[PDB]
């Protein structure tokens, strides 16, 4: 019949996993006890994004809005434009499309309009330098997120173009049982509709924390000015630690609010990057949900990923349980033979997923 | 707590600053002969890794992950099985069980490249039942044969080409692209006759939920008043309202003289004015080329031979020729469409 889920929790993943598996799902009891029950506006918009990139899918929402039944179709893709509501930035909608784009009949060329940054969701640079490289490791050779216009909150006004030119049968089998070596730290400090001094004040703050390290540090100052600087003033920074040996990356990001010191934000994000590195074994905590899914939809082979003791949190468990409910796959965790650290190896057998929408 | 929040939880800023005053804790982080052999080595290595890991897992853990490996003698229980299968069971006829991938479960339009078998006597007709054998499944469908018209559109064909492939669209369980198949028209022994029973061979190229097959529709009118380039045409349209919809449309004569629908004439209804690149004759016929959509019939009749008592006289929807014979109906024919010998008188001019 239907695989049943509860609550708004993991809304995008459950919809995304259903699309990849082809198994219909039902999500019920979404915010039943709230004063405003049911789906949020950005969730309804996200479903409108799903139907625009697939064909034959049936999405029926209850009269009260607290239950959703989804019967996935085939991933088709194509060229389209999506108007992101102010409640969520573009990254909230770009991120799920990364899971589906490489397995589409036609190339994904989606134009996203709206706010381009937030405190809780993925930023433009996080996708470009933090998630897309992981896709490249798995066989997605060509993927691009062009920033035509930046939009800071609250009035937004940004524009970004997602283009995934690589269509593949399925992600390759992963094999990473080591701790990648960080060779350098890079990043982008950006600002919209404000003086150029602010972006420089970040890099001074970020460099203050990272100068003690033994590697090179080079942070970009990407100041946005003119018609393409959006409609509101805003600034933010994104730092990326890079391992060129196998092209792995760890990143941290945050934006600035009204009245906040640019130096403090540069310091805070620099501290968070080090914390993320300490909590990571092969991928960052914010990249882990992306990598695991590509393992699940791989070929009928055993892929191996090294993870840290800290990465196994409440978020990690709910991901694995949701995967099993959909794909019936079980993640097998084994200790490493080392004693310097407490890392495990997460071994997953792929379901033999194949891109059957692509014409041959 | 939840994946909707992409950013992970971090400790308080001042705590992290105190924690990361010293960065020592993280300072630790900072030939085969032929190409063919190289590939085979890659496959063998991965297969080796599979064997090593499964050995490490427990026997119960191993079964839980990989499942019942081939070579295992297994007992599989089924429910809601038809009673006719148990009753009309013949041990001579084998029971073959095949697992299905997620795509096999879905139903939709299957796009395939199909050809009449060289030893089959007759060509196949559109919307004519054909028993297909895709993967593990056998079923009867109504396919539509199509052509690309130099890669511009999907135009419906009447029959399969005599000695080549043609695109075919039929509704049935979806299968992965590049899966070959074969087609038969008759499976019952009573209708077998003496001819070769393998009708069509092909390969599935794409799977979709919808298709846009289209059929050429030509509107025909005739001239009744001619002034050099300009001419007035009749019988193409019924009312001036229809003409206004097609004003500016491209038209031509049988002779190949191109023209345009200029204006609709007020009197009589349906008559209109057109201009041609050269003077047309009264004997000429003007044609407007247009395209009308065609729909695939959603007909699905799986071949359940084992359920039947006989198991060799399964019969489904019959062919058009057979249907006509049963009800004694003459094959439809248009006298104008028939071909006749044309003798041309020598052309002379004043």
């Amino acid at each position: 019949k239907y695989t049943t889920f509860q609550g708004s929790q993991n809304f995008r993943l459950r919809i995304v996993l259903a699309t990849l598996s082809g198994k219909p799902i039902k999500i019920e009891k979404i915010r039943s006890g709230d004063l405003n029950p049911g789906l949020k506006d950005y969730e309804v918009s996200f479903l409108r994004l799903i139907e625009s990139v697939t064909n034959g899918s049936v999405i029926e929402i209850s009269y009260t809005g607290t239950t959703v039944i989804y019967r996935p179709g085939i991933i088709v893709g194509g060229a389209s434009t999506h108007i992101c509501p102010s409640s969520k930035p573009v990254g909230y909608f770009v991120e799920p499309m990364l899971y589906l784009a490489p397995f589409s009949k036609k190339k994904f060329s989606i134009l996203f309009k709206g706010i381009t940054a937030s405190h809780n969701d993925a930023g433009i640079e996080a996708i470009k330098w933090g998630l897309m490289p992981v896709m490249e490791k798995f066989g997605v050779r060509e993927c691009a997120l062009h920033t035509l216009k930046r939009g800071s909150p609250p009035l937004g006004g940004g524009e970004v173009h997602l283009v995934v030119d690589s269509l593949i049968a399925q992600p390759i089998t992963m094999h990473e049982i080591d701790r990648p070596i960080i060779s350098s730290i890079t990043g982008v400090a950006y600002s919209t509709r404000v003086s150029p001094s602010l972006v420089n004040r970040m890099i001074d703050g970020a460099k203050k924390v990272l100068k003690n390290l033994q590697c090179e540090v080079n942070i970009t100052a990407d100041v946005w000015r003119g018609e393409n600087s959006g409609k509101s003033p805003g600034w933010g920074i994104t730092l990326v630690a890079q391992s060129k040996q196998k092209g792995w990356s760890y990143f941290a990001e945050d934006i600035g609010d009204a009245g906040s010191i640019p130096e403090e934000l540069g310091e805070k994000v620099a501290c968070q990057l080090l914390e993320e590195i300490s909590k990571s074994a092969a991928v960052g905590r914010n990249q882990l949900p992306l990598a695991i899914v590509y393992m699940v939809i791989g070929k009928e082979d055993i892929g191996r990923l090294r993870i840290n003791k800290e990465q196994i949190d409440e978020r990690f468990i709910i991901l694995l349980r949701d995967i099993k409910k959909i794909f019936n796959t079980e993640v097998f965790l084994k200790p490493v033979d080392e004693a310097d650290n407490e890392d495990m190896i997460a071994t997953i057998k792929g379901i033999g997923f194949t891109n059957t929408s692509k014409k041959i | 707590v939840d994946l909707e929040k992409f950013v992970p939880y971090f400790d308080t800023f001042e705590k992290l600053a105190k924690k990361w005053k010293s960065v020592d804790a993280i300072k630790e982080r900072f030939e085969y002969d032929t190409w063919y052999e190289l590939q085979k080595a890659k496959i063998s290595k991965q297969l080796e890794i599979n064997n090593i890991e499964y050995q490490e897992m427990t026997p119960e853990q191993r079964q839980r992950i990989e499942g019942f490996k081939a070579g295992s003698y297994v007992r599989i229980v089924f429910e809601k099985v038809p009673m006719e299968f148990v009753k009309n069971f013949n041990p001579k006829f084998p029971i073959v069980m095949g697992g299905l991938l997620p795509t096999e479960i879905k139903f939709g339009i299957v796009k395939a490249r199909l050809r009449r078998h060289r030893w089959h006597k007759k060509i196949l007709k559109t919307n004519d039942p054909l028993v297909l054998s895709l993967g593990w499944r056998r079923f009867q469908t109504l396919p539509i044969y199509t052509t690309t018209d130099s890669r511009t559109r999907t135009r419906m064909l009447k029959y399969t080409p005599e000695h080549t492939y043609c695109n075919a669209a039929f509704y049935g369980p979806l299968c992965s692209p590049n899966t070959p198949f074969c087609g038969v028209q008759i499976v019952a022994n009573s209708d077998t006759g003496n001819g070769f029973r393998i009708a069509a061979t092909g390969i599935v190229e794409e799977i979709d939920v919808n298709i846009e097959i289209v059929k050429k529709l030509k509107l025909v009118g005739f001239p009744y008043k001619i002034f050099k380039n300009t001419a007035f045409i009749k019988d193409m349209f019924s009312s001036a309202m229809e003409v206004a919809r097609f004003e500016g449309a491209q038209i031509k004569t049988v002779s190949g003289i191109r023209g345009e629908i200029k204006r609709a004439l007020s009197k009589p209804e349906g008559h209109y004015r057109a201009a041609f690149e050269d003077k047309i004759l009264m004997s000429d016929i003007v044609i407007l080329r247009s395209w009308y959509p065609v729909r695939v019939k959603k007909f699905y009749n799986p071949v359940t031979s084992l359920l039947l008592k006989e198991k060799t006289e399964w019969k489904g929807l019959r062919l058009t020729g057979q249907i006509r014979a049963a009800m004694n109906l003459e094959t439809p024919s248009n006298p104008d469409s028939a071909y006749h010998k044309i003798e041309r008188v020598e052309r002379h001019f004043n």
Binding site: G38, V44, L47, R48, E51, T54, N55, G56, S57, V58, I59, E60, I61, S62, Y63, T64, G65, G73 | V209, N210, E212
Partner: peptide, 14 residues
């Protein structure tokens, strides 16, 4: 041009 090649659709009954 949007409706030409679609079969599904989000059926909202709210």
């Amino acid at each position: 041009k949007m409706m030409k090649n679609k079969r599904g659709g989000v059926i909202d009954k709210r």
